[PDB]
């Protein structure tokens, strides 16, 4: 991620030259369910957290 925040693929040579870490973003699908003892259940999923 550049200073402006623009993502770009990181080549291994650029990581070597610019002293970066060759890392891949990790995302996880998270499903959240909430119960409020009111015989209603709300299930909201946050894809790729």
Binding site for another protein (CB under 8 A): 1-8, 14, 17-19, 23, 26, 30, 32, 34, 46, 49
* Other CB atoms within 10 Å distance of the CB of residue 15: 13
Q: Smallest distance from the beta carbon of 39 to another protein, in angstroms?
A: 19
Q: Smallest distance from the beta carbon of 23 to another protein, in angstroms?
A: 7
What's the rounded Cα separation, in Å, for the pair 29 and 6?
24
Whether 49 contacts 31, CB under 8 Å: no
CB-wise, 18 or 41, nearer to another protein? Answer: 18
């Amino acid at each position: 991620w550049e200073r402006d925040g623009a993502p770009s693929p990181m080549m291994p040579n650029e990581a070597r030259l610019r002293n970066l870490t060759y890392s891949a973003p990790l995302y996880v699908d998270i499903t959240k369910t909430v119960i409020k003892e009111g015989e209603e259940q709300l299930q909201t999923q946050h894809q790729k957290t």
